């Protein structure tokens, strides 16, 4: 019916439509807009901006990770026109899987350095975290950039063309049993950020109201956009994940072998997932363009 | 391509380049206060608890402070008001005792506009102290407000007069939206205008931190 | 006490009487017959990337070869600027300077500023490093500009309305120049040392005599304070940027104004003037963030130098004229070429 | 006292009593050493690279 | 004043590991670059290592490289040469040459008193032909040196040194750089010359000159010297 083998035991892998109805629309909106914003964005940065403050740095970096995750859009869209028949190969299917993997982590990375930079630059003003020289900011990046490398290459070292019947498959969040690290990673890079940039914010709003800047214009407009930013990436990485954990619940308590329940379930998945998406198209009207310096 | 002294040379030049950035990074970590006024009305009575410029350099809670005292600089503040563009704070003192005669306190309004609204200082906030409160208390006891300021409508108490008087140097102010005045009636008292002064530096530091990450 | 007031209009009314009288030909119609220079081109050869504050005052060596440069981190960095090398960085007492002076020798550098006094660092010493030589104090203002005659002579323009002329092996002022109504915000010495140029605050340029002391001429038309002042390669004439956003041509043996540098556009001050080595280019650093180049006998913008982020507050042309380096509030140099 | 206004007559009639040149000749002077030293003005005529010392 | 003091010398069984001190009291010792030169016996100059201000460039000559180690400490300003495996071919003077370079300066101006030690038991080739010439007071004399490799450098500036060795006591910098006279040598010295052919004139030649003079290369590392020659009478 819908079992298949994915290198593992009971992968249970489907194609069926409400996928090329609504993903088109909803990946090529993203696609426009979130292009758009990003090389407006990266230009403003590269022949525009000559302060270059570690905070910069961070949103630059951040800016890269978005512009990336959303150039590997159109090769997905071409995977979700036709339902889940691929047909670029091996190594376009695996690079592209390995992008988006390692862009979206990249990206909550810089999110959650960006967020620890603001605490840091409200809660303790009087700390040589806030001074750190430019090339301390590139080699923080440059580490944090081969974290995420670091443990999202294994999507890059495996033989990646799925032939499910006569199409080929450029899935890397099936539903097989296994707990691999691409389910691992993919759970604690919402959860473990989203637990820092709670405490940042939460203590960003609380010392800014103890000290009484709230009565400021331009205090309440940065209160406002720090609640907004933390609200976007909740709103943005949570129903992939708590599906995802539906996902394993259902997996290892009922229907482990027969699987002609998980239909909607992963139909379900997917259509959260594209909101991964949504956030990088997001990211720049609420870092960059809302700035007041822009 | 370089020869041996050459190459020395360039070695030479990037120690001095690391020692350039070393000091600079710890210059960087200081405050900068500007300290204003109009001779008598207090200045050296505020640095007492810590022929051209003068610093003077103090710590408070691993904070370390400059206080740059123009003073006795007898030419055209234009010429070089520019220099400290770019201080944490202008600490501006004023005397209530100044009220009398010879006015005073309107030569005090004069400078603290010209400070306070220059094209240089747009953003750096205003530390506003109010030196000799005890003299002004008894001043009043006796003389009223109004012979230095022509229109009051208020009682000869220390309390509205105070409060007049800051709010009529507080309305000099012509942009209030991006710098910010704080007003401390300080005396001998305590260390409290030390707190004082790093409340209002740790405010303006973080209004500056803010605008680094661009969320100002 | 009327009479005196009364005088001293006749004298001044004489003086304009009699410049008129010698004022017979504006040089714009002597030389108008001549080609102008044409566009101009400069670019950033070097950029010279060590300071990290404003920088106030630049100095060229004589060998055309290394410059001294003082910014308000309280540094003063000495550049190699064929290679942008830092020969020397010497930490300052005070961090306020608003002059810089290179010794025609070479052996020295002074520095001044808010801080009134002019202090000589020796470049050569047997210890390997650069020692203060000697701090002269004597000015009641803050110091603005400070040349070098000679090893031992320094002649200094302070904010208190006064040049002095001093000894540096005695610390003392051998000379004072008192005739200024207003701070004297820059100074020129004549190529021969037997004179030099004031710029002061009063919108006035005074030309005195190093040997005894006394202005000799005295040069008004500009309408605000006088930031730059340059002499003329020829030593027969001097240059002045003031905050009227104009910079006009004077002529010691005329002793008139020649020549007007203005236009429509600029409506900033003048930090800092320089000639080129023949004179023909006129070179003003302005608070636009650029230097406009014009052509010293034409009186038109003959180029731009636009390459700072902040105003630009001093200007030097090298002694062979090969480059010109300029100074901004952004702490960074720039050699043109 | 007064001496100020002693001391700007002396100053005035010292300046006043100066020979002074017509303004012709002296822009002529002006004009005659611009054109001689021109040849050696790199920054007017700009310098071939090969022995500019900022070549690069 | 300046000053450089050696310490550490004295006789050594072969294989030994005698380590070598100097002492600088008088000048900014962090920012001079510091080099150890050797004097056989009888024999001429022969540099053996440098250690840059900061410590970031250390070099050593091919004879040594392996066996010697040099170190600075600068706290206390003392320059150290741990040498180890200790052969009959390291019986030498050692000197303690400070060396600041950066645009018009002048290398190897001080050179420190030397200590002696006893061992029981592609380079430039810098020529000086002749090795004595005899000299009367009031005459003028050239001293000629060749070397093997153009010393001219694409700075413009010929990287050659002239070094006198007055009888008991160590060198003494007269001309850095083939042209310029070094501080407190008298106008009398005078140094010229092209690519591999240069020439030192002591013109109104006369006492307190008699010795040895060294020509030494600085183009690139190892430091080569002349044989040297001698001038007595
Ligand atoms: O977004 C990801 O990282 C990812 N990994 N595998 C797959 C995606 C998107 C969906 C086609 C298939």
């Known amino acids: 019916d819908h079992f298949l083998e994915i290198d593992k035991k009971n992968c249970c892998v489907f194609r069926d439509d409400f996928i090329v109805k609504v993903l088109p629309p909803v990946l090529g909106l993203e696609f426009i807009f979130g292009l758009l914003g990003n090389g407006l964005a990266l230009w403003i940065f590269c022949f525009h901006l000559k302060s270059w403050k570690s905070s910069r740095i961070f949103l630059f970096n951040l ?60 809660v303790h003003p009087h700390h040589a975290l806030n001074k750190i020289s430019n090339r301390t900011a590139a080699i923080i990046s440059c580490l944090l950039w081969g974290i995420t490398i670091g443990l999202t290459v294994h999507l890059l070292k495996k033989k990646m063309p799925i032939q499910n019947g006569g199409a080929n498959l ?80 259902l997996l290892h308590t009922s229907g482990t072998q027969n699987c002609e329940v998980y239909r909607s379930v992963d139909l379900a998945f997917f259509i959260t997932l594209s909101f991964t998406y949504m956030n990088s198209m997001l990211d720049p009207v609420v870092y960059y363009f809302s700035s007041p310096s822009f | 391509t370089l020869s041996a002294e050459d190459k020395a040379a360039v070695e030479r030049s990037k120690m001095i380049d690391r020692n350039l950035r070393e000091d600079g990074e710890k210059a960087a970590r200081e405050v900068k206060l500007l300290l204003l006024g109009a001779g008598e009305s207090g200045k050296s009575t505020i640095v007492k608890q810590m022929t051209g410029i003068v610093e003077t350099h103090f710590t408070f809670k691993d904070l370390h402070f400059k206080m740059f005292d123009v003073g006795a600089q007898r030419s055209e503040r234009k ?118 002064v790093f409340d209002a530096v740790t405010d303006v530091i973080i209004k500056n931190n803010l605008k680094d990450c661009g969320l100002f | 006490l009327d009479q005196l007031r009364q005088e001293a209009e006749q004298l001044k009314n004489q003086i304009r009487d009699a410049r008129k009288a010698c004022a017979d030909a504006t040089l714009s119609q002597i030389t108008n017959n001549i080609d102008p220079v044409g566009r101009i081109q400069m670019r950033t050869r070097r950029t010279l990337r060590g300071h990290l504050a404003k920088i106030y005052a630049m100095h060229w060596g004589t060998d055309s070869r290394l410059l001294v440069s003082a910014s308000q981190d309280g540094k003063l960095i000495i550049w190699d600027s064929y290679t942008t090398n830092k020969v020397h960085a010497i930490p300052l007492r005070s961090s306020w300077v608003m002059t810089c002076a290179y010794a025609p020798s070479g052996n020295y550098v002074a520095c001044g500023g808010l801080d009134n006094i002019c202090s000589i660092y020796n470049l050569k010493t047997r210890e390997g490093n650069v020692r203060v030589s000697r701090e002269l104090a004597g ?67 005074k030309l005195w005599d190093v040997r005894e002391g006394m202005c000799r001429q005295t040069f008004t038309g500009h309408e605000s304070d006088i930031n730059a002042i340059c002499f003329f390669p020829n030593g027969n004439a001097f240059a002045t940027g003031s905050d009227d956003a104009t910079c006009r041509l004077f002529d010691l043996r005329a002793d008139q104004e020649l020549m007007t540098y203005s236009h429509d556009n600029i409506i900033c001050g003048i930090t800092s003037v320089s000639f080129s080595k023949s004179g023909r280019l006129l070179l003003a650093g302005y608070d636009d963030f ?48 | 006292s007064i001496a100020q ?52 | ?62 004879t040594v490289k392996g066996r010697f180690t040099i170190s600075r400490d600068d706290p206390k300003n003392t320059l150290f040469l741990q040498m180890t495996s200790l052969r009959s071919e390291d019986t030498a003077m050692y000197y303690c040459v400070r060396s600041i370079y950066y645009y018009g300066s002048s290398p190897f101006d001080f050179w420190g008193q030397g200590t002696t030690l006893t061992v029981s038991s592609s380079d430039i080739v810098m020529t000086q032909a002749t090795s004595s010439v005899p000299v009367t007071p009031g ?47 008298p106008d009398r010295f005078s140094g010229s010359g092209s690519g591999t052919a240069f020439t030192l004139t002591i013109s109104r030649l006369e006492a307190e000159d008699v010795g040895v003079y060294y020509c030494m290369q600085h183009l690139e590392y190892p430091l080569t010297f002349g044989a040297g020659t001698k001038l007595e009478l």
């Not at chain 2, 030569?107 to 306070?116: A, G, N, P, R």
Request: charged residues 20%; contains cysteine.
């Open chain 2, 79 to 196: 010429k070089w008001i520019h220099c400290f563009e770019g201080v944490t704070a202008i600490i501006f003192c004023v005397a209530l005792s100044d009220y009398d005669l010879v006015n005073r306190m309107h030569e005090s309004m004069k400078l603290f506009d010209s400070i306070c609204n220059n094209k240089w200082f747009t953003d750096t906030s205003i530390i506003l102290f109010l030196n000799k409160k005890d003299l002004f208390e008894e001043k009043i006891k006796k003389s009223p407000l109004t012979i230095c300021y022509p229109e009051y409508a208020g009682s000869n108490t220390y309390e509205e007069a105070a409060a007049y008087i800051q709010c009529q140097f507080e309305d000099l102010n012509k942009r209030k939206d991006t710098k910010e005045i704080y007003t401390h009636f300080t005396c001998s008292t305590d260390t409290k205008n030390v707190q004082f």
């Open chain 4, 5 to 56: 206004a002693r001391k700007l007559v002396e100053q005035l009639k010292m300046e006043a009593n100066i020979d002074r040149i017509k303004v012709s000749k002296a822009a002529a002077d002006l004009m005659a050493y611009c054109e001689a030293h021109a040849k050696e003005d790199p920054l007017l005529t700009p310098v071939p690279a090969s022995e500019n010392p900022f070549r690069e």
């Open chain 3, 139 to 205: 000015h009641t203002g803050y110091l603005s500009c400070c040349r070098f005659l000679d090893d031992n002579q320094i002649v200094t323009s302070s904010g208190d309305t006064t040049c002095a002329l001093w000894d540096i092996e005695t610390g003392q002022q051998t000379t004072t120049f008192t005739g200024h109504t207003g701070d004297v915000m820059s100074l020129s010495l004549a190529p021969d040392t037997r004179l030099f140029v004031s710029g002061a605050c009063d919108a006035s340029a």
């Open chain 3, 290 to 337: 650029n230097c406009n180049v014009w052509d010293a006998l034409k009186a038109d913008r003959a180029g731009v130098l636009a390459g700072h982020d902040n105003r630009v507050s001093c200007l030097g042309v090298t002694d062979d004229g090969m480059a010109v380096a300029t100074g901004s509030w952004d702490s960074f140099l720039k050699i043109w070429n």
């Open chain 5, 139 to 185: 005459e003028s004399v050239s001293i000629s040196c060749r070397s093997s490799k153009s010393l001219l450098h694409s700075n413009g500036n010929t990287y050659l040194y002239w070094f006198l060795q007055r009888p008991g006591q160590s060198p003494q910098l007269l001309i850095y750089r083939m042209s310029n006279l070094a501080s407190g040598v």
């Open chain 1, 63 to 122: 800016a890269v990770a978005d512009f990336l995750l959303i150039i590997c859009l159109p090769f997905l869209m071409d995977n979700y026109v036709r339902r889940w028949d691929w047909k670029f190969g091996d190594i376009p299917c695996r690079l592209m899987l390995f992008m988006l993997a390692m862009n979206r982590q990249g990206s909550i990375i810089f999110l959650t350095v960006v967020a620890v930079d603001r605490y840091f630059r409200v």
């Open chain 1, 170 to 249: 450029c899935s890397s969040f099936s539903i097989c049993h296994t707990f691999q690290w691409h389910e691992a990673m993919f759970l604690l890079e919402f959860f473990l950020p989203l637990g820092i940039i709670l405490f940042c914010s939460a203590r960003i709003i609380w010392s800014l109201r103890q000290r009484q800047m709230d009565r400021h214009a331009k205090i309440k407009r940065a209160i406002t956009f720090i609640m907004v930013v933390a609200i976007v990436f909740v709103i943005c990485f949570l129903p992939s994940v708590v599906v995802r954990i539906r996902i394993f619940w």
């Open chain 5, 1 to 62: 004043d300046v000053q450089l003091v050696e310490s550490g010398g004295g006789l050594v069984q072969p294989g030994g590991s005698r380590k070598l001190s100097c002492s600088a009291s008088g000048f900014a010792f962090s920012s001079f670059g510091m080099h150890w030169v050797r004097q056989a016996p009888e024999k001429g100059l022969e540099w053996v290592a440098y250690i840059s201000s900061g410590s970031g460039t250390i070099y050593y000559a091919d």
